[PDB]
Amino acid sequence: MKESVRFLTDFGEISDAISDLLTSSPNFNVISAIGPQGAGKSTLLSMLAGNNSRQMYREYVFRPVQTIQIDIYIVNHQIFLDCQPMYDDSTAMSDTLRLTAFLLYVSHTVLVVSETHYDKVIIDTLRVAEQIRPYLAIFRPKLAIDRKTNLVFIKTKASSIDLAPTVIREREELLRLSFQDSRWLKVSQEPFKTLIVLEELNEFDEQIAELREELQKNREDFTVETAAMDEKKWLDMCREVIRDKTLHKTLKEYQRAMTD
Amino acid sequence: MDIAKWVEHARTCYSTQLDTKIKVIGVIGKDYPDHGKGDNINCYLRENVFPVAATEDETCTIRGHFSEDDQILFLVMNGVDDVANIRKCLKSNPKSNYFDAMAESECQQIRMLHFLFISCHFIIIFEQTSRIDLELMRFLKKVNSARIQLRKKINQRLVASDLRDVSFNNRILSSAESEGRMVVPRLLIAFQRLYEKLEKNLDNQFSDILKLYDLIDCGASSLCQLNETIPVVHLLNPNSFVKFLEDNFRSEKNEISLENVIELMNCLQCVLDGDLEEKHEKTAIQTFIKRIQNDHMEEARRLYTKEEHLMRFNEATHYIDSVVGVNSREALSQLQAQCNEMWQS
């Protein structure tokens, strides 16, 4: 795989070309990236995918150019999903929430990239997306029902005072308070591991390598059994969430609550 | 100083200036590291009046300071975004949930924005991102909606307090335009950071967005208005900003006396206290939560529908434990009480 590919086709259906790019190992990691348009997560997520400092922009793996879209890229059983940025005002909230709820359910860890952490509206979106749930009890292999998805908030293009440990601690506390009652989301309770701050050579990539390593730690498998789900069976799970009827019903009641 | 406390003693602290003609200026902003909301306005006063960060005691309050030299009563809002407010909400009782915790401060920010937009000659929005905050716009739309349903009751209180026939400025308003309010404020916005091309562009955006949320050009249903020619958007440097405010302030001759403004702050406390609202009103997110859980419960009861009562009782619990995020503990206890009831009859 040379560059990203579109994960969805028309009308938010999974592209027919994704299953052929998936191997058959139970050892795979799903990382998604969400956030507003300006934060530059597409370039950041690609750095974590493989790019190496001063490589031509033409060679980046996620280069942004259909209503909803997600970009897919995989190396060494590592699945990276790059969601379209967040935004009629009513329909923009419903589409942003639909993609967010989907990536929370299918990812091990979701990177929440923004220039404005702490941001209540971003936090509001995550905890509402948490409630958009499917019912996949008939799915085999049985799925972990109390599973929590890891969230790593990344403040990009940050200033000198954003790097102050006292400011990061203050903001991380709010982030930990925002998910203390969450059922299927979680943030690290270790200082400086919940809110990552970057400013904007070799010293930069050392963080990406260190961050890349940390994103393999706090994972929780989708399956009840260890190593029971293949990455292709993960794609089957993805089709079953987007199809689940209870999820569809709850999305619609959200759209109604926003227009009312 | 909290506006609620400001009224009780203002009559005597400014006993010598009760006839002075003043303006009332509202201020909307967010706290940042080493930069509070009113750091640009206290800089206009050359007196550090408002804090770098609102403390817990100051959260969800309008903070008033009357500059005697400038004949201006400034109103700075401590909103939902203050670090101290988010700390206070999410620590008061962890036995609650995120939605019900933040909801209360959200409602108070609507009440306080409603307070400002019916009692200020000008309101200035401070924004640091460089893009217009649509979450604020969404708030203002909810403010304008609440205003329309409480204008009739609020207008009754302007009549009872004997302020309805008091002019706020030279502009005349019809009974429909003025119901429940004392003015249609002129809205300004200052962005923190070929410069002329960017102001005209943001001016167009700003007006377009305000129109898109039906906040201007709606007659009596408008929440505010914009100047006709005087700049509305300003680009703060990393004094140009004083001139931006003076051109606005000096376009309107002071009219209303401090004595009537004081009585107005006293009269409009019912807005901040919610004394005119219907009891038990929930936000859009709270109603969304309660609706999906009412459906999730109604569906779980559908699953339970003789000896294998535990069989059909357990499959429903697996559903409620799969889909309910908040109040899940109470949801499970409530349903099984429902299932055991049906499992007897």
Author numbering:
A (entry chain B): 59 to 123, 134 to 155, 172 to 284, 305 to 364
B (entry chain A): 1 to 193, 210 to 254, 289 to 355, 381 to 420
Passage from the reporting paper:
The SMG1 kinase is an essential NMD factor in metazoans and is associated with two recently identified and yet poorly characterized proteins, SMG8 and SMG9. We found that SMG8–SMG9 is a G-domain heterodimer with architectural similarities to the dynamin-like family of GTPases such as Atlastin and GBP1. SMG8 and SMG9 interact with each other and inhibit the kinase activity of SMG1 in vitro. Nucleotide binding occurs at the G domain of SMG9 but not of SMG8.
Using bioinformatics analyses and proteolysis experiments, we identified regions C. elegans (C.e.) full-length SMG8 (873 residues) and SMG9 (385 residues) as sufficient to form a stable heterodimeric core complex (SMG8c, residues 1–423 and SMG9c, residues 59–375) and to yield diffracting crystals. After overcoming crystal lattice defects (detailed in Materials and Methods), we solved the structure and refined it at 2.5 Å resolution with Rfree of 26.0%. SMG8c and SMG9c contain a similar globular fold with characteristic architecture of G domains along with additional secondary structure elements. The major structural difference between SMG8c and SMG9c is the presence in the former of a helical bundle of three C-terminal helices (α7–α9) that forms a stalk-like protrusion reminiscent of the stalk domain found in GTPases of the dynamin family, such as Atlastin and GBP1 (Daumke and Praefcke 2016). The G domains of SMG8c and SMG9c face each other and interact with part of their convex surfaces. In particular, SMG8c helix α2A interacts with SMG9c helices α4 and α3 (patch 1) (in particular Val83SMG8, Ile86SMG8 with Leu258SMG9, Leu261SMG9). In addition, the stalk domain of SMG8c folds back on the convex surface of SMG9c (patch 2). Here, SMG8c stalk helices α2B and α7 interact with SMG9c helices α7 and α3 (e.g., Ile335SMG8 and Phe338SMG8 with Val212SMG9 and Tyr358SMG9). The SMG8–SMG9 heterodimer forms in the absence of nucleotides, with interactions conserved from worms to humans. Finally, the SMG8c–SMG9c heterodimer is formed irrespective of nucleotides, while proteins such as Atlastin or GBP1 dimerize in the presence of GTP analogs.
